[PDB]
């Protein structure tokens, strides 16, 4: 398994970013890719041991990569621009022209100003009493609204444990003001459980939304609370 | 050499999914690689072959005698297999992963008991409207009122109860928002229930 | 071991002396091409073979793997250095010698190990720099090497030629004389 | 005395009776000694020396390395041979014959020819000579051409005609050069 750090990165224009990639044990070839929404894989640079044979593929002189190790490789983007915002994927093979295995990626977002960055407002909605009596199932909705940029990870936690069965989250959030360029996003999720499970007041239902905003390096000047990489939750107990 | 495959494919869950690929201009030293991508997640390697049929733990690959065509078989197709499948030719100087248009396979869920209804949920005012248990044939369209927000249909899967359902969420802070006129621009079927 | 046609795709060489490296493709003991690792381009030896396009990146990656493999073997063998072998030098003409007609002088240097050799032509004591060309280090069955040096000529009775070969295996530089007779 | 460490890699392809018998032998050499190899007939990595044993076990354990190497017979050898059939195997260079005395000696100079296969016979008034004829080994020029010198010990007399019969794959009919005393 190929490791990549960080998972998400939100930065201002002109700032420098450092993207790290840890390959599979024994793999001597590393590959750096760039991918935009609704578009194919764009090659940047690749390494064979410690040396980079093909320097071409990099958009500008601002883009650089180093593998001194030569195991773990770091991709540096100095004086970041809005056009540099993409998912940066890392791939590895035993040596060149061999089967490539990709990492989870690094979602990068470069903004003109950090003033329009906002954390999400997470609210959990208890299932309708009509639904419990009609289909003998209870569906509780979670709503994460007024967040910018769309760097959220929604997870449902039942009795302190993450649940995947009977969970559905939207793959892409919707813009609250589609006319605006720096429009605040909104995302919804559903958790369906049996009528018997919901009617038990002992059961705890918590909707977790992992927001990726500003880090320790990022500066804040505005009066409002700093939109740091925070977890915003909304909990609800069962109703007898 | 280049690969050509259909843009999208709709396949029922449980049934075997056969994805075609055309590569008539292929050479003897080139492999037939298959990769998949779920939304914007990291691409996942599936299987690759040169001359004959290959069998992996994930899928099966059948290459023709003339090698001008190939097929990817997913025996037990599930909702987790809903991804964009790329058929790539790898051989010689090929060291870069070049993705084409791909085939986006949407495995279609099996709605055993369709019961279209719109329910109003309360906060643990403000209220949301849930259009659920509707069949896969009906399409959820965006709201005419921009102050009203409607999400696209997403498929829920309860593995514990062996039940699958489609759902849409509608909400607005406007005074006063109606739950009966929330999914008017969709448009919902005639047998939709409103309590 | 026994075959009608023997080919090498390809001959990968890397030594810690330079550090210099070599990448070639051989067919029936003849060099098809050599990849210039500095200029990053494939240099073919036959005009008919130039219709194909070999990626120079293939050689550069192979050298990087051979660099890693060499360092790993020095550590494993407890720095076992290569044994310097005595090379066999022979000088002959490409076609029958005719005074005033163009001919090519060939200096065959066989059994070269390690593959580090300086081959220079000399005419009556004076070093020749004009009309000289050399082939890459061609591999052998016993994993040794052989190099061939060419010299464009216009034979003359008073003009004498010598092939100076500089190798560590030799006590002094070997000079093989050629007379047009 | 300069110390040097040499590492070699040879992707050797063997062909017999066209494509009927195809063999791949991937050799890893350090320095003149082969440490580990991959043969197509065994279908797995096998060490030649103790130094190659850690490498052999490391590559045999990895599925990706073992997969590519077992498919290299069709990918490298069988694919490249198809490219050779219309290039290097199609190369035919017409040999040039010249008879010059040396007279008790007479040498038949057969120069600049491809492929290597050649049969040269000496004749004395339609009668073939086998006892007093010495031939030099097939000389490789290196520039995809060969040469062979065939000497003959002769006792000439008036009326004698010495014919040098030469057979080559590039010729439909043999080239015969005559010499008179």
């Amino acid at each position: 398994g190929v490791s990549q750090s960080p998972s998400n990165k939100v930065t201002e224009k002109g700032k420098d970013v450092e993207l790290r990639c840890d390959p599979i044990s024994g793999h001597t070839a590393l590959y750096w890719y760039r991918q935009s929404l609704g578009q194919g894989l764009e090659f940047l640079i690749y390494f064979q041991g410690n040396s980079a044979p093909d320097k071409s593929g990099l958009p500008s002189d601002r883009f650089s990569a180093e593998r001194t190790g030569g195991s773990v490789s770091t991709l540096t983007i100095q004086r970041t621009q809005q056009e540099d915002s993409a998912v940066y994927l890392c791939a590895s093979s035993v040596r060149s022209t061999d089967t490539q295995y990709f990492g989870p990626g690094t979602r990068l977002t470069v903004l003109e100003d950090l003033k329009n960055v906002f954390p999400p407002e997470v609210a959990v909605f208890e299932p309708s009493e009509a639904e419990i009596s009609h289909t003998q199932k209870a569906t509780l909705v979670c709503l994460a609204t007024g967040f910018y940029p769309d760097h959220v990870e929604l997870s449902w936690w039942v009795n302190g444990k993450e649940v995947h069965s009977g969970v559905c989250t939207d793959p892409q959030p919707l813009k609250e003001q589609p006319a605006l360029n720096d429009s605040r996003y909104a995302l919804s999720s559903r958790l369906r459980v049996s009528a018997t499970f919901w009617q038990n007041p002992r059961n705890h239902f918590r909707c977790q939304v992992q927001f990726y905003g500003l880090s320790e390096n990022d500066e804040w000047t505005q009066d409002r609370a700093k939109p740091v990489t925070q977890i915003v939750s909304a909990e609800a107990w069962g109703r007898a | 050499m280049k690969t050509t495959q259909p843009p999208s494919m709709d396949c029922a869950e449980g049934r075997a999914a056969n994805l075609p690929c055309n590569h008539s201009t292929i050479s003897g030293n080139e492999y037939v690689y298959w990769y998949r991508q779920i939304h914007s997640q990291g691409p996942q390697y599936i299987i690759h072959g040169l001359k004959n049929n290959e069998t992996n733990e994930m899928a099966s690959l059948i290459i023709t005698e003339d090698r001008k065509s190939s097929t990817l078989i997913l025996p037990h197709a599930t909702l987790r297999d809903t991804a964009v499948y790329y058929c790539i030719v790898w051989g010689g100087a090929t060291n870069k992963l070049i993705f084409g248009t791909g085939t986006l396979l949407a495995v279609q869920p099996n709605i055993q008991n369709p019961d279209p209804a719109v329910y109003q949920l309360r906060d643990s005012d403000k209220s949301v409207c849930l259009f659920t248990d509707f069949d896969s044939q009906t399409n959820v369209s965006q709201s005419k009122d921009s102050d009203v927000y409607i999400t696209d249909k997403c498929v829920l899967d309860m593995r514990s109860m062996d039940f699958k359902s489609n759902s849409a969420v509608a909400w607005s802070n406007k005074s006063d928002f109606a739950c009966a006129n929330a999914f008017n621009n969709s448009i919902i079927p005639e047998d939709t229930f409103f309590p | 071991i026994v075959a009608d046609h023997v080919a090498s795709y390809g001959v990968n060489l890397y030594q810690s002396y330079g550090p210099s490296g070599q990448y070639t493709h051989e067919f029936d003991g003849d060099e098809q091409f050599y990849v210039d690792l500095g200029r990053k381009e494939t240099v073919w030896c036959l005009p008919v073979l130039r219709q194909f396009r070999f990626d120079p990146q293939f050689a550069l990656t192979n050298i990087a793997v051979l660099k890693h493999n060499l360092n790993s073997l020095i550590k494993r063998s407890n720095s076992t250095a290569a044994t310097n072998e005595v090379p066999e030098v022979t000088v002959f003409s490409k076609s029958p010698v005719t005074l005033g007609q163009p001919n090519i002088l060939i200096c065959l240097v066989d059994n070269i190990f390690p593959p580090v050799v300086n081959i220079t032509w000399l005419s009556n004591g004076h070093s020749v720099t004009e009309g000289v060309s050399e082939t890459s280090f061609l591999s052998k069955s016993d994993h040794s090497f052989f190099k061939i040096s060419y010299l464009t000529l216009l034979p003359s009775a008073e003009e004498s030629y010598d092939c100076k070969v500089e190798h560590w295996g030799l006590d002094k530089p070997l000079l093989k004389h050629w007379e047009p007779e | 005395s300069p110390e040097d460490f040499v590492y070699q890699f040879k992707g050797m392809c063997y062909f017999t009776n066209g494509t009927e018998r195809v063999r791949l032998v991937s050799r890893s050499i350090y320095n003149r000694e082969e440490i580990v190899r991959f043969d197509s007939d065994v279908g797995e990595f096998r060490a030649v020396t103790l130094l190659g044993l850690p490498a052999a076990e490391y590559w045999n354990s990895q599925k990706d390395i073992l997969e590519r190497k077992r498919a290299a017979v069709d990918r490298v050898c069988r694919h490249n041979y198809q490219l050779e059939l219309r290039t290097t195997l199609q190369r035919r260079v017409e040999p040039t014959v010249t008879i010059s005395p040396s007279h008790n000696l007479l040498v038949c100079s057969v120069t600049d020819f491809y492929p290597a296969q050649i049969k040269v016979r000496w004749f004395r008034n339609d009668q073939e000579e086998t006892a007093g004829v010495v031939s030099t080994p097939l000389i490789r020029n290196g520039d995809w051409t060969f040469q062979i010198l065939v000497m003959l010990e002769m006792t000439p007399q008036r009326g004698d005609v010495y014919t040098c019969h030469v057979e080559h794959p590039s010729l439909q009919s043999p080239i015969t050069v005559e010499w008179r005393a």
Binding site: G26, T28, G49, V94, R95, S96, T97, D98 | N29, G91, G92, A93 | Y9, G10, N12, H25, Q32, F52, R53, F54, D55, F58, N62, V65, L66, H68, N69, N71, S72, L73, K75, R76 | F9, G11, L24, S26, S28, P54, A55, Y58, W59, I65, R68, A72, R75, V76, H79, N80, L83
Partner: peptide, 13 residues
Amino acid sequence: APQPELPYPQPGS
């Protein structure tokens, strides 16, 4: 284009 045989890396280094 000629397809070449690729050498693989040595463990330990």
